[PDB]
Amino acid sequence: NCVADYSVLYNSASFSTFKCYGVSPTKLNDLCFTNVYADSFVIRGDEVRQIAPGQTGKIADYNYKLPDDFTGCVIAWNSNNLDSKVGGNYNYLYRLFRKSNLKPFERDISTEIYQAGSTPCNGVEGFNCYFPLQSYGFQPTNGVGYQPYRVVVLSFATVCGPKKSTNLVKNKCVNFNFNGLTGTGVLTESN
Amino acid sequence: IEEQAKTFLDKFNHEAEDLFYQSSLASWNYNTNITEENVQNMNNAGDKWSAFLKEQSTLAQMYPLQEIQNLTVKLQLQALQQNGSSVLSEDKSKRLNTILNTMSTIYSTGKVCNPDNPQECLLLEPGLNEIMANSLDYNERLWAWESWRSEVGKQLRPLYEEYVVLKNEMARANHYEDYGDYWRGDYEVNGVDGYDYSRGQLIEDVEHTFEEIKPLYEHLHAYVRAKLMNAYPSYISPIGCLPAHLLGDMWGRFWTNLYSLTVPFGQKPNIDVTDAMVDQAWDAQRIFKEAEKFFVSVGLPNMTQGFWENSMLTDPGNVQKAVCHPTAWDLGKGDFRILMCTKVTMDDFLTAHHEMGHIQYDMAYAAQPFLLRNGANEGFHEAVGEIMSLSAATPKHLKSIGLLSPDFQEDNETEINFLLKQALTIVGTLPFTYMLEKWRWMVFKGEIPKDQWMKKWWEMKREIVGVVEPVPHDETYCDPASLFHVSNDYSFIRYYTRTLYQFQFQEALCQAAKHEGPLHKCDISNSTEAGQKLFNMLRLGKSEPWTLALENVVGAKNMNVRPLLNYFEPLFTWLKDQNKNSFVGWSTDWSPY
Numbered sequence: 001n002c003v004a005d006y007s008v009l010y011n012s013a014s015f016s017t018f019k020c021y022g023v024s025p026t027k028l029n030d031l032c033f034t035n036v037y038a039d040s041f042v043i044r045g046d047e048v049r050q051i052a053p054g055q056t057g058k059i060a061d062y063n064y065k066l067p068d069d070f071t072g073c074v075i076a077w078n079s080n081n082l083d084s085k086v087g088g089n090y091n092y093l094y095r096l097f098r099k100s101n102l103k104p105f106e107r108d109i110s111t112e113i114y115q116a117g118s119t120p121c122n123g124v125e126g127f128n129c130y131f132p133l134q135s136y137g138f139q140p141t142n143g144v145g146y147q148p149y150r151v152v153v154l155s156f157a158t159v160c161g162p163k164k165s166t167n168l169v170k171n172k173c174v175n176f177n178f179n180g181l182t183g184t185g186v187l188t189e190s191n
Numbered sequence: 192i193e194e195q196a197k198t199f200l201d202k203f204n205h206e207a208e209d210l211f212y213q214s215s216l217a218s219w220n221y222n223t224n225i226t227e228e229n230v231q232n233m234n235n236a237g238d239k240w241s242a243f244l245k246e247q248s249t250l251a252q253m254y255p256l257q258e259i260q261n262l263t264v265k266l267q268l269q270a271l272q273q274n275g276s277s278v279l280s281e282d283k284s285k286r287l288n289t290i291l292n293t294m295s296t297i298y299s300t301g302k303v304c305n306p307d308n309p310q311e312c313l314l315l316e317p318g319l320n321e322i323m324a325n326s327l328d329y330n331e332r333l334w335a336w337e338s339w340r341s342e343v344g345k346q347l348r349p350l351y352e353e354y355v356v357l358k359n360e361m362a363r364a365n366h367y368e369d370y371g372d373y374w375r376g377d378y379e380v381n382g383v384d385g386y387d388y389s390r391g392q393l394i395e396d397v398e399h400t401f402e403e404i405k406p407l408y409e410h411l412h413a414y415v416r417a418k419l420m421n422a423y424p425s426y427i428s429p430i431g432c433l434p435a436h437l438l439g440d441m442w443g444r445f446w447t448n449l450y451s452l453t454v455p456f457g458q459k460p461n462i463d464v465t466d467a468m469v470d471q472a473w474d475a476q477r478i479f480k481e482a483e484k485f486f487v488s489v490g491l492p493n494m495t496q497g498f499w500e501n502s503m504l505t506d507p508g509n510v511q512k513a514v515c516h517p518t519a520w521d522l523g524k525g526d527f528r529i530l531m532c533t534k535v536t537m538d539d540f541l542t543a544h545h546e547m548g549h550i551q552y553d554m555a556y557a558a559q560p561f562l563l564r565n566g567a568n569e570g571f572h573e574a575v576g577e578i579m580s581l582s583a584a585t586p587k588h589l590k591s592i593g594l595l596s597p598d599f600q601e602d603n604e605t606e607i608n609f610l611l612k613q614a615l616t617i618v619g620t621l622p623f624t625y626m627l628e629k630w631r632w633m634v635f636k637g638e639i640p641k642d643q644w645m646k647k648w649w650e651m652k653r654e655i656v657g658v659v660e661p662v663p664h665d666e667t668y669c670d671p672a673s674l675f676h677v678s679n680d681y682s683f684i685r686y687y688t689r690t691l692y693q694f695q696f697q698e699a700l701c702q703a704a705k706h707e708g709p710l711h712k713c714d715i716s717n718s719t720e721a722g723q724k725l726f727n728m729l730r731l732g733k734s735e736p737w738t739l740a741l742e743n744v745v746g747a748k749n750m751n752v753r754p755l756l757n758y759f760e761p762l763f764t765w766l767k768d769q770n771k772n773s774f775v776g777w778s779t780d781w782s783p784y
């Protein structure tokens with residue numbers, strides 16, 4: 001239920017990489033659709049390479065699966081100056097292990113100790129069983145592949161892009177389009 | 192079963208790198224800002240790093256290595272599961288630590304008193320080594336050389352006779368039959384098919400290559416003797432071994448300081464570019480950017496940007512307490528940086544090519560697992576730096592990078608003046624480098640007993656190096672321990688293998704570069720294949736073994752010395768005309784006293 005200026009994101013100078021995976025970036029004004037959800041998170045720069053349609057590895061298999069048939073887009077930008085700390089900004093959390101492979105758009109927030117091969121386990125994470133949650137200690141001195149990137153995903157009726165309007169020429173023979181009605185004529189101020 | 196071992200080491204690789212980072216951050220901050228407040232910080236960070244590392248080792252030990260199939264996970268289990276230390280009983284561990292601390296304090300604080308004037312005393316580096324490097328009074332040197340041994344070296348005797356026990360009991364407890372076999376273990380390779388390698392085979396291949404050096408060394412020795420006979424007349428026989436106090440430092444480890452006494456053509460000035468560096472008014476930034484211009488010219492990667500903000504290349508503007516020791520840092524998290532105290536000199540320009548050549552290694556394997564981000568053996572990690580030094584020392588690079596004028600000229604008298612200074616450094620040390628490891632290998636196995644230690648040492652100085660005791664020694668002395676590499680617990684075979692590999696790594700890329708002359712004249716600039724055949728090995732680290740890595744660069748399944756000897760065929764061509772009336776090699780039986 002809003003008009004979505006999506007191409008202004010694509011034309012802005014701040015973002016480091018942006019791509020779309022069911023749509024071209026010039027058609028981002030022409031889109032109209034029922035509902036969408038926007039996603040956001042902070043991740044390491046070389047691991048953003050997993051955050052495209054259908055891919056494998058770490059985030060894509062154990063946190064956040066994108067499908068090969070993703071009608072959507074992803075936008076990513078460097079964030080050292082706010083999202084890294086000299087002591088390592090361990091507030092950001094990632095999953096290293098989980099059974100099965102995630103369904104596209106699947107989320108999980110529960111955890112149990114991983115028990116690879118076969119063993120019982122009740123805390124401690126000592127031998128053959130592992131706590132799967134880990135923290136990302138981002139530091140302002142990291143090499144580019146380990147620097148923090150701010151990342152957004154767009155999961156493409158109520159939401160058309162911006163409907164462009166021209167100047168309005170009066171007293172002349174003109175072709176015209178007013179909302180959805182088209183014609184040709186002379187336009188004059190009525191009483 | 193393997194997924195337990197994979198998930199356990201995947202967790203090590205995600206856990207460890209953070210702790211490695213905030214340990215090495217305090218160590219970086221200490222070395223650039225030296226304060227007790229940063230010493231205590233780097234101590235208490237390094238403590239928590241070790242307390243993690245040793246715990247993860249006893250966890251890795253529960254996983255049976257015979258349940259593994261994959262090669263990667265196997266080498267990372269074997270790197271973390273290894274004891275080494277902590278196999279000793281707690282008292283014997285502290286006794287070894289007590290001996291190590293005692294040999295460390297003896298070597299670092301060892302004063303030598305002047306018998307002409309007892310109120311003046313010298314430490315080793317700030318005075319006693321200076322005599323050996325830059326004085327020509329035979330008796331002042333002989334005093335400095337024998338007084339290091341008698342007033343300091345003697346202190347290490349009763350300690351080395353007990354270090355050799357506790358280190359062998361440590362090796363044995365690990366099922367390495369001696370501590371020499373334990374140090375040889377770096378070069379070992381297993382289960383890779385064909386490219387496997389043995390601890391004992393390292394002895395056989397060092398001794399199979401050493402005899403190819405001897406015909407060159409016995410001409411270079413007879414030449415260095417024929418020149419030392421003019422600097423030290425009546426003291427030296429025309430056929431003799433060389434008196435050890437005349438070899439240019441406290442042990443005779445390199446002949447490079449004998450140049451001014453030994454030079455082929457003292458009437459021709461050997462090349463420099465320190466003048467062109469100050470004529471263009473270069474700084475550390477320019478020197479290292481001209482090095483990055485060399486690296487992008489062969490076509491290796493650029494720096495990761497953060498190298499320039501986070502490295503230190505000159506001293507600070509403050510009269511800040513910081514170490515001037517040029518050091519390559521990999522901190523983890525992709526953070527590569529150099530720390531040094533640089534000064535505008537062509538030696539520092541070669542340094543820049545060398546230390547950025549170390550960072551190109553640290554950078555290339557950075558996608559490999561953390562337990563695997565190291566040199567394929569301890570000789571590779573310096574040989575990969577020194578090829579970038581040697582390519583940059585050439586008159587072709589120096590003229591084409593604009594450091595020599597277009598109308599500067601070079602001649603055959605200049606070519607031999609360079610090659611002899613290379614040989615006094617590269618060839619003269621190889622006998623010593625084989626000899627020191629061989630003596631230690633034979634001590635740790637017990638082929639030399641404690642009642643023949645100093646006896647066999649000097650019999651080997653006379654048989655391998657052609658060098659004679661200036662003054663008699665017996666089993667009250669410890670001349671091996673009077674050197675840093677013995678008293679502070681360092682393996683030394685890395686220098687032999689590196690001094691082989693440097694010339695293999697050179698000639699492999701000289702073929703790729705279409706090089707047209709003698710091996711020293713080679714430059715790997717503007718080329719693609721010379722960067723590409725190298726990058727195939729540089730991306731490995733430890734993730735594939737050195738025996739296989741040599742086949743990717745050179746096409747050799749094992750180490751060779753031919754390439755080194757080919758870098759000296761033009762100098763041997765000159766020695767064969769100079770030395771015709773010389774006694775080639777030496778009489779082992781002569782003595783100066």
Ligand SMILES: *[C@@H]1O[C@H](CO)[C@@H](O[C@@H]2O[C@H](CO)[C@@H](O)[C@H](O)[C@H]2NC(C)=O)[C@H](O)[C@H]1NC(C)=O
Pocket residue numbers: 224226511
């Ligand atoms: C060496 O580094 C330390 C810490 O990095 C400096 O010590 C203090 O650093 C804090 C920053 O957290 C400043 O607020 C203090 O003013 C510093 N102390 C002093 C006495 O200035 C220290 O200054 C550095 N060394 C030098 C010579 O500047």
Ligand SMILES: *[C@@H]1O[C@H](CO)[C@@H](O[C@@H]2O[C@H](CO)[C@@H](O)[C@H](O)[C@H]2NC(C)=O)[C@H](O)[C@H]1NC(C)=O
Pocket residue numbers: 197261262263264
């Ligand atoms: C076990 O060995 C296999 C191959 O012998 C490795 O498999 C490769 O894994 C990477 C990423 O893990 C993939 O991109 C490759 O395509 C795989 N190769 C093949 C041929 O399938 C595997 O990585 C090894 N195990 C570990 C933990 O490294």
Ligand SMILES: *[C@@H]1O[C@H](CO)[C@@H](O[C@@H]2O[C@H](CO)[C@@H](O)[C@H](O)[C@H]2NC(C)=O)[C@H](O)[C@H]1NC(C)=O
Pocket residue numbers: 252272273274277278
């Ligand atoms: C590391 O050293 C120990 C000896 O200090 C090796 O033997 C184990 O010793 C512990 C007590 O410290 C015993 O509980 C274990 O039962 C011993 N191991 C076995 C196999 O029974 C240990 O094996 C060494 N590590 C390796 C890789 O061999």
Ligand SMILES: *[C@@H]1O[C@H](CO)[C@@H](O[C@@H]2O[C@H](CO)[C@@H](O)[C@H](O)[C@H]2NC(C)=O)[C@H](O)[C@H]1NC(C)=O
Pocket residue numbers: 603604607
């Ligand atoms: C450098 O090059 C010159 C020219 O080739 C060498 O001079 C020759 O030396 C040989 C050996 O003594 C003589 O047979 C020739 O007669 C010399 N040439 C001429 C034109 O007279 C010179 O000896 C070379 N020096 C070195 C160190 O290689």
Ligand SMILES: *[C@@H]1O[C@H](CO)[C@@H](O[C@@H]2O[C@H](CO)[C@@H](O)[C@H](O)[C@H]2NC(C)=O)[C@H](O)[C@H]1NC(C)=O
Pocket residue numbers: 488716717
């Ligand atoms: C090797 O690389 C250097 C660096 O690009 C080349 O130097 C250029 O040479 C041309 C003509 O010789 C000059 O006009 C340029 O100004 C030089 N560039 C720089 C940055 O100084 C050199 O030509 C290359 N060698 C070959 C054989 O191509």
Ligand SMILES: *[C@@H]1O[C@H](CO)[C@@H](O)[C@H](O)[C@H]1NC(C)=O
Pocket residue numbers: 487491492493
């Ligand atoms: C390396 O950086 C320079 C600018 O300093 C640039 O010209 C060059 O293209 C970069 N190297 C590569 C491989 O692109």
